[PDB]
Design a protein around this ligand. Structure first.
Ligand code: HEC
Ligand code: NA
Lengths: 382, 105, 125, 147
């Protein structure tokens, strides 16, 4: 309906070619296209569509600001993307009669180029946890051979799916902890209600080895639902409602707690600044930098959009920059290449704004992304 | 099979028989975590706080199916009569961290 | 109206997102699809379990505990969408978390989200 | 002066059944006169208070009064409301409740009951501001119990 400057350029270039081809005597021979090979600039946007029974995922070339493909999903699916770009997958839920009838939970794996499903694995007894989309409630092990998903009721548990053998393996009983952060083919961490982290080591058989770390935050400090986790760096970046940031180093195989840093300056906190949104934090591995969505807001408006992004050095906590986004932004993420792109998704505008992660300048945008787009996913191919 | 339901819906705590085996629910917990009772006894749960709670036994505990008790509001009760000897674990549906146990001897 | 500003409750229109009982509603107001303030629309399934929130009533100055039970087994209504988070805590404190689909206990194991009701279950703090 | 009644039938408690030993302490005298237990948070008696609780109460109420086969005693909820006050707590121990929770006058001296009570108060996991059995100075130094 309304064209962005980027799609307007694409549209014109395409018309130019069609007109020239016609004049040169070329004929039209329709076929099915393959998407370009996965690269550092490919970005995935998921649309939970405000809890609708069916959803959509958009595959975007961040460099050109063009939709290169799409994927259909069920009710509140959890998307995962292999860091090496060899495949994409999601844990999904469908029903025999739209939103009622027999429920089927399943995992689908897709070819990154043809977008065709290469695997469809049914999950016994509908064990998926149906909740607003949290990237780390469904995760891939670093080797990309295993997918882990969370079950809330009737008891906390983590399902193990063998993507290699294309089969569901077993449910792992865990303590009252949430989220899944894999660090090895057979190990992952969770965050528990008591404020500690739980390390779970499992195998093909037997009860798992569970060990708790020390409590790293008090009862009154609230850790958001969308922490940033870099599997390749083993860095867990977890902001609190006030912008204080807890960083955990899991690269050794055991949790090492780094000094907490305030993402907001003394003056901003005094002026009512607080982080807010959906995917509020992003982490760039190579630059070792943290990006956080912030704005002036009341303490209980933590899920509303924000118009600013602050950047800080993760090692020192030094404020590097503060960008005025110029739009109501709900989620952010970044490409993991040399000169990163800063992705800013607006649920309200159903638009993905693409900025230069260094200057904060808006480069291009892609609109009409579903009904209520909320999640951005990128691959760390480096 | 291992327990009968005296009442399908929760009732006023005032109706709870005097001297009945009671498990109070308050401050996000079953106040008596490991209740021991004799076969035939009727256990009664009473929610003492505004926060709604219930008792939930997974499938294979009291029968082939699970028993998702009704949610109790403040001052509401729900009962279960155990017929078989054994240990029965349960939790609160929306609050999985709340756990209790009934030992029938 | 600034979405980031402190939420201000009113007690004169239940179909507006600032109605006092919706202080922690997430989704859609059931009254806009055939239900009522405290009842589910025809054909949907009523959940028994839910997240709660202490909402301030500007009329009598008291705070009441609201149980946000969802009506399930239907595709989202799409009418009167609202998202408030007064006192809403992260998922590891589920008793007060509202991104969770609170459909547990609904008949026929219905787990799809249609709308949310705002019944009072007691006085709060 | 406090009113000491049986928490179940409301009859006056009979202190004539109390053991002769341990009814003379300054603590007991002050308590019977004011209803205040000076042993609360008293570092000098806590060690022994813990031992008393361990041998006489832990088996039913749990190692940390979190509850086991008997009800928990470490939070703001009380089956018998008067137990939020030391006069009420004392009355429960002396006169007994129902079932296996019977009178303790045959096994504990009045002084020992007060010391045992002090340990139960020490195990409170609630908010200090809600510990009405503590003086302002005591509240200042009180920290919810943690194993
Ligand atoms: C098992 C044989 C017990 C021992 C030993 C002790 N208590 Fe107990 N206590 C027991 C039961 C089964 C009950 C419930 C009684 C009822 O009428 O409901 C209790 C109760 C109490 C209470 C009242 C708690 C309330 O919620 O109001 C108190 C304060 C209490 N018990 C204290 C207490 C102490 C200090 C003990 C060691 C001397 C002790 N109990 C031992 C069972 C048993
Ligand atoms: Na108690």
């Amino acid at each position: 309906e309304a064209e962005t400057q980027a799609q307007e350029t694409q549209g014109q270039a395409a018309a130019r070619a069609a007109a020239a081809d016609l004049a040169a005597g070329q004929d039209d021979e329709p076929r099915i296209l393959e998407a370009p090979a996965p690269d550092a600039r490919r970005v995935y946007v998921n649309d939970p569509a405000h809890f609708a029974a069916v959803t959509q995922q958009f595959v975007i070339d961040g460099e050109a600001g063009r939709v290169i493909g799409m994927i259909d999903g069920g009710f509140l699916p959890n998307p995962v993307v292999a860091d090496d770009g060899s495949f994409i997958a999601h844990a999904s839920t469908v029903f025999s009669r739209i939103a009622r009838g027999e429920r089927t939970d399943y995992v689908e794996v897709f070819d990154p180029v043809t977008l065709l499903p290469t695997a469809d694995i049914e999950l016994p007894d509908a064990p998926r946890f149906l909740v607003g989309t949290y990237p780390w409630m469904t995760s891939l092990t670093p080797d990309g051979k295993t997918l882990l998903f969370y079950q809330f009721s009737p008891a906390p548990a983590v399902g193990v799916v063998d993507l290699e053998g294309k089969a569901f393996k077993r449910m792992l009983d865990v303590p009252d902890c949430y989220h899944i952060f894999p660090t090895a083919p057979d190990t992952f961490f969770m965050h528990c209600r008591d404020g500690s982290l739980a390390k779970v080591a499992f195998g093909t058989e037997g009860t798992p080895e569970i060990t708790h770390t020390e409590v790293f935050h008090p009862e009154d400090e609230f850790l958001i639902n969308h922490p940033a986790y870099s599997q390749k760096a083993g860095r867990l970046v977890w902001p609190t409602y006030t912008g204080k940031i807890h960083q955990i180093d899991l690269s050794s195989g055991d949790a090492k707690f780094l000094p907490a840093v305030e993402a907001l300056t003394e003056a901003e906190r005094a002026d009512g600044w607080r982080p807010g949104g959906w995917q509020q934090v992003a982490y760039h591995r190579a630059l070792d930098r943290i990006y956080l969505l912030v704005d002036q807001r009341d303490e209980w408006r933590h899920k509303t959009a924000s118009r600013f992004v602050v950047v800080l050095d993760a090692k020192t906590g030094e404020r590097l920059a503060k960008f005025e986004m110029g739009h109501e932004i709900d989620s952010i993420n970044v490409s993991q290449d040399e000169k990163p792109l800063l992705y800013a998704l607006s649920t309200g505008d159903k638009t993905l704004y693409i900025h230069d992660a260094e200057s904060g300048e808006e480069l291009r945008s892609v609109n009409q992304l579903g009904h209520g787009p909320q999640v951005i996913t990128t691959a760390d191919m480096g | 099979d291992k327990a009968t339901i005296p009442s399908e819906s929760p009732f006023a705590a005032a109706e709870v028989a005097d001297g009945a085996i009671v498990v109070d629910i308050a401050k996000m917990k079953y106040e008596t975590p490991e209740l021991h009772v004799k076969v035939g006894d009727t256990v009664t749960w009473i929610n003492r706080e505004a926060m709604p709670h219930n008792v939930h036994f997974v499938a294979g505990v009291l029968g082939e199916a699970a028993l998702k008790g009704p949610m109790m509001k403040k001052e509401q009760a729900y009962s279960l009569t155990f017929t078989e000897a054994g240990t029965y674990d349960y939790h609160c549906t929306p609050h999985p961290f709340m756990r209790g146990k009934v030992v029938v001897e | 109206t600034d979405p980031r500003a402190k939420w201000v409750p009113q007690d004169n229109d239940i179909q507006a997102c600032d109605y006092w009982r919706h202080c922690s509603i997430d989704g859609n107001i059931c009254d806009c699809s055939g239900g009522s303030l405290t009842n589910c629309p025809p054909g949907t399934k009523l959940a028994t379990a839910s997240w709660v929130a202490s909402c301030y009533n500007p009329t009598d100055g008291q705070s009441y505990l609201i149980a946000y039970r969802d009506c399930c087994g239907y595709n989202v209504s799409g009418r009167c969408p609202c998202l408030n988070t007064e006192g809403e805590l992260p998922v590891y404190r589920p008793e007060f978390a509202n991104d969770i689909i609170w459909c547990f206990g609904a008949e026929d194991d219905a787990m799809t989200y249609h709308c949310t009701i705002s019944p009072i279950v007691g006085k709060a703090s | 002066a406090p009113q000491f009644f049986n928490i179940i039938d409301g009859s006056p408690l009979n202190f004539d059944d109390a053991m002769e030993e341990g009814r003379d302490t300054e603590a007991v005298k002050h308590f019977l006169e004011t209803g205040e237990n000076v042993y609360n948070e008293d570092p000098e008696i806590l060690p022994e208070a813990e031992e008393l609780y361990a041998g006489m109460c832990s088996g039913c109420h749990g190692h940390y009064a979190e509850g086991k086969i008997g009800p928990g005693l470490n939070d703001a909820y009380w089956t018998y409301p008067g137990n939020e006050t030391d006069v009420g707590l004392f009355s429960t121990l002396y006169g007994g409740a129902t079932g296996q929770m019977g009178p303790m006058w045959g096994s504990l001296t009045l002084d020992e009951m007060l010391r045992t009570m002090a340990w139960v108060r020490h195990l409170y996991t609630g908010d200090p501001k809600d510990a009405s059995w503590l003086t302002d100075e005591q509240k200042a130094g009180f920290t919810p119990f943690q194993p």
